[PDB]
From TrEMBL, chain A:
<dbReference type="GO" id="GO:0005198">
    <property type="term" value="F:structural molecule activity"/>
</dbReference>
<dbReference type="InterPro" id="IPR011747">
    <property type="entry name" value="CHP02241"/>
</dbReference>
<dbReference type="InterPro" id="IPR010667">
    <property type="entry name" value="Phage_T4_Gp19"/>
</dbReference>
<protein>
    <recommendedName>
        <fullName>Phage tail protein</fullName>
    </recommendedName>
</protein>
<dbReference type="Pfam" id="PF06841">
    <property type="entry name" value="Phage_T4_gp19"/>
</dbReference>
From TrEMBL, chain B:
<protein>
    <recommendedName>
        <fullName>LysM domain-containing protein</fullName>
    </recommendedName>
</protein>
Amino acid sequence: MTRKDPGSSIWFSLAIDGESLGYFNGCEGLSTQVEVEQRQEGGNNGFVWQLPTRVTYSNIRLTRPLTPDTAKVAKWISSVQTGIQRPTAQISALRADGSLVARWGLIDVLPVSWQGPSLDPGSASVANEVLEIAHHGFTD
Amino acid sequence: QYTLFGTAGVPIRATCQMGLVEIPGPTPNRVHRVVAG
């Protein structure tokens, strides 16, 4: 037991391989869904049958402080015209010891949206560019 | 249209449209006065 090794939501490690995107700073929305189909039996009141049908992986929003290395992301996104590349990503959650609690690796990524910084003279914060990521499956 | 089928197959809720058209009932079997104008 060793007083267990509980999960946490601060220590992590977010990275994208391939183009020199580097390490990100915040994940969101990592989710897998299936699309159940509801067929209602006519002669048996009481419930609707639930039958599984396919699985579907939702998009992921990754955020990081606006660093001068943001030119790489715009280069990657605007490379669709001349040919794109799908590198392999990773999303890992850690405890403060630096050990591993669960490691997910995105099979193939693809940019979807890039919400840039929201400049504002009165708001004291730090610009957080958002890079949405498309998905193809988990790794194992 | 049948809906809400009960157990053992008997229908329960049924909606039935109807189209009706009338049938004629025919064959039900000139003095005038005079005014100054």
